[PDB]
Amino acid sequence: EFNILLATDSYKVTHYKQYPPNTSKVYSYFECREKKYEETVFYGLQYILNKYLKGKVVTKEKIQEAKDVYKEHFQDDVFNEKGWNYILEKYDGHLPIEIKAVPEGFVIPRGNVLFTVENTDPECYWLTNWIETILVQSWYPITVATNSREQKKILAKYLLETSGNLDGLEYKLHDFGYRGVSSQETAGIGASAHLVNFKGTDTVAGLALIKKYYGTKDPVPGYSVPAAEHSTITAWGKDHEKDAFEHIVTQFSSVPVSVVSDSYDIYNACEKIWGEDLRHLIVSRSTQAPLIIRPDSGNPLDTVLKVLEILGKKFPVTENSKGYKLLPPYLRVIQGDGVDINTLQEIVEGMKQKMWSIENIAFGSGGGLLQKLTRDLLNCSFKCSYVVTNGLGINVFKDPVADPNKRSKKGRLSLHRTPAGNFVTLEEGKGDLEEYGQDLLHTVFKNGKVTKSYSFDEIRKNAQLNIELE
Amino acid sequence: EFNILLATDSYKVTHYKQYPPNTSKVYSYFECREKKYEETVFYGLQYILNKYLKGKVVTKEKIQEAKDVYKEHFQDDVFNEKGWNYILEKYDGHLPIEIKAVPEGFVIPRGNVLFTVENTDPECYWLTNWIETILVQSWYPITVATNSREQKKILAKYLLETSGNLDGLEYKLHDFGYRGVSSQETAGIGASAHLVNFKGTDTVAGLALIKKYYGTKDPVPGYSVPAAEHSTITAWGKDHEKDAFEHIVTQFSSVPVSVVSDSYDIYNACEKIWGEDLRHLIVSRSTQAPLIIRPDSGNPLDTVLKVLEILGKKFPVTENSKGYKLLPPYLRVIQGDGVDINTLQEIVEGMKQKMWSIENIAFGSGGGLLQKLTRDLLNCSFKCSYVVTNGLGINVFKDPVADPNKRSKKGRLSLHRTPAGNFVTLEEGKGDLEEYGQDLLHTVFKNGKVTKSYSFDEIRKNAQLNIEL
Ligand SMILES: O=[N+]([O-])c1ccc2[nH]cnc2c1
Ligand SMILES: O=[N+]([O-])c1ccc2[nH]cnc2c1
Secondary structure, three states, X not given: OOXXXXXXXXXXXXXXXXXXXXXXXXXXXXXXXXXXXXXXXXXXXXXXXXXXXXXXXXXXXXXHHHHHHHHHHOOOOOOOHHHHHHHHHHHOOOOOEEEEEOOOOOEEEOOOEEEEEEXXXXXXXXXXXXXXXXXXXXXXXXXXXXXXXXXXXXXHXXXXXXXXXXXXXXXXXXXXXXXXXXXXXXXXXXXXXXXXXOOEEOEOXXXXXXXXXXXXXXXXXXXXXXXXXXXXXXXXXXXXXXXXXXXXXXXXXXXXXXXXXXXXXXXXHHHHHHHHHOHHHHOOOOOOOOXXXXXXXXXXXXHHHHHHHHHHXXXXXXXXXXXXXXXXXXXXXXXXXXXXXXXXXXXHHHHHHOOEOHHHEEEEXXXXXXXXXXXXXXXXXXXXXXXXXXXXXXXXXXXXXXXXXXXXXXXXXXXXXXXXXXXXXXXXXHHHHOOOOOOOOEEEEEOOEEOOOOOHHXXXXXXXXXXXXX | OOOHHXXXXXXXXXXXXXXXXXXXXXXXXXXXXXXXXXXXXOOOHHHHHHHHHOOOOOOHHHHHHHHHHHHHHHOOOOOOHHHHHHHHHHHOOOOOEEEEEOOOOOEEEOOOEEEEEEEOOHHHOOHHHXXXXXXXXXXXXXXXXXXXXXXXXHHHHHHXXXXXXXXXXXXXXXXXXXXXXXXXXXXXXXHHHHOOOOOEEOEOHHHHHHHHHOOOOOOOOOEOOOEOOHHHHHOOOHHHHHHHHHHHHHHOOOOOEEEEOOOOOHHHHHHHHHHHHOHHHHOOOOXXXXXXXXXXXXXXXXXXXHHHHHHHHHOOOEEOOOOOEEOOOOEEEEEOOXXXXXXXXXXXXXXXXXXXXXXXXXXXXXXXXXXXXXXXXXXXXXXXXXXXXXXXXXXXXXXXXXXXXXXXXXXXXEEEEOOOOOEXXXXXXXXXXXXXXXXXXEEEEEOOEEOOOOOHHHHHHHOOOOOXX
């Protein structure tokens, strides 16, 4: 079972002995520090508050366990047993911490305070940064949600340009990342973050996470369709690819079905198998049940363009009202290999140049969407900005000589709307001067309880694109 | 509770309708496909077997839960309820699967079979690839362990060259990755994978994972020392950095202590604060309890060299038998910013050029060590290579025309030692000809039971570098 006393960076176990004597308050904050990604989607803190921080998180057993582990880990007795015992005895193991945060789903420019953390009992001055490690992992859902939204911006731009509307946008980027992430827990968190922006996912783990921690009016937040993988095509044998295709599209004759078509020769599969031998089984399909052809190898752009040219010559193509080519409604393509924010851009631009509507194509992304991201991408960072020692408040910060980008904010922080309606973070307690109206941060956690929460429906609304709002 | 019926890629829910009819066997394998990183450390499967796959993993409630979710998720009834019910009824919810694997810790060249998976009951042909998603996540501890070991190889080469030995090698790369990974679970898995090669970690989650799933003779597999962060320095106030330093080294006077020294001006801190104002508190320290100065910003190579240059002028430097400069034993440096396999190499080579021994330095790595890695790095991949349909075995594979690198292996596989003592994977069941000694894959899982386990001690022994052998 999870033990918050064993869920911190080792060195933090020794920090209670390093702060100035008579420190009664440590106040810290999280930002995506300014340094391609000008704004960030704030998402994921609510998961962490509920799963890890709320309620009785300290017990006699957990304290003894941590004591025993750290004794060996440090080869010395440095663990603050008395400190954790105080929390157990005084607060029935509930953390005397207050956390204020921007609403989940909010889209906020870089370099703004997103959440703050401080102890509510002077004895627990050390607790604020103990939980840095747990809270900082919010970088991951933030970064997934943000990068996923940036890809939605690209898709919206090109879909609107080539078709004149945004129909189906929320299904244009499917999550294929389940196998390509580092753990089951990561799969659920990352998939949930993608679902802030889109509705298509194969990472089933995200559904239960959203249901438990956020909630939606709909039964599920995300959807999928039947689809083949290489094993279900190749199992039929090298000479029986056509047989596999026929079996699969006949089994799934009245729902959409994706079929990976590159097992041996994608171009042959498209031109001869789909385009000639099985063509009669494709042109009979409903608009609600298209065949989705899935290439999965080769240069992503070149392959998509060639697949489209092949299909364009075997199937009846129309020209939509914007002048772009459109496959018949029973036939679509999905590119789910080598897709990341950069290649996504390359492919839609290349399609546009060849006069193919973005209506024709959908994308899937795996490692690119959920794994190939780090804390450095948005410079997600947690720092102390204010302490009280001997009853006097001190504005504190770091400001390394060789890297001005790592300079942290000073003092008590608040988030405000500017006269032009933008965000500003006030430092040094200046929010108190009341020149900038009310603090936009909300208290979300206080003394062991979650004090404010958001449904996944609210989060999605907050995270909408301006082009969707317009 | 974790529900294995909800722990697969969505489309796999539909695959039981797609395989050829009359298929009684689906046999699949995992490899780090050949395409840098020429050999891989096999580690992490045992975690997955015990946590997720063993024992009674199917119940009536879990089947109903999956049925309910998939109904909404697909807006359709596709779901092999009968198939899952069969496992529940016939096998008390234990998976009729056999997995054979190379021993954990083994170091194997790219392009070799590392483990195979197959159903043991003809009714469960669909189950082999159901569990692909969960098993393929082994890519992560494999890749962390492999990338960590490659960094150890660089450190070993340079330490040996500049010092004449490998003393302290196992503490030269510390895991600072806890806050920089995507989840608590990842933290533990990745930290454990790093401990295959090294003994220094701040990612505490790794200790409990190793204790629970692998085990060590020693109480713990990993260690740390007291150390400062920016908060414990900056809280003293901008004008009181020296007071913070003095307080911290005095609190931790008889153990090693790392102190981040770049809050305001790393160069001033080293030259004026440590090098003058507080020098008397440093030169009195034990060899078993040095001050470890930690820069944490600026160009990693440039900052390390300038820090050594400064300290070398304030503290007595010796020249070792190899001709390299060595700080006094009470004083060391750790660089834990911007360290990955590339920059690590750059720093030790830069030090060597400036005649500084690698004895002087240790490294810490966070995102570089545990997060900035993907399944693409070693091409970790799971593919079906053999099926039995209508009582006949068929060797199956993919071979996409535009990417020969994605061609997969054919038929039943086995791993063998070559006459020269290397590795070879035999395809098409050719291992049965018995020309190549015994198969190195062992049955590790069969019908819900873990059948062969390794301790963390054995794994570490298997993963040793040639240089230390
Ligand atoms: O799993 N798939 O390959 C998959 C899932 C959903 C899809 N929607 C359109 N194509 C798809 C492929
Ligand atoms: O957390 N640290 O900064 C840290 C931990 C362990 C160390 N061993 C040597 N330097 C260290 C720094």
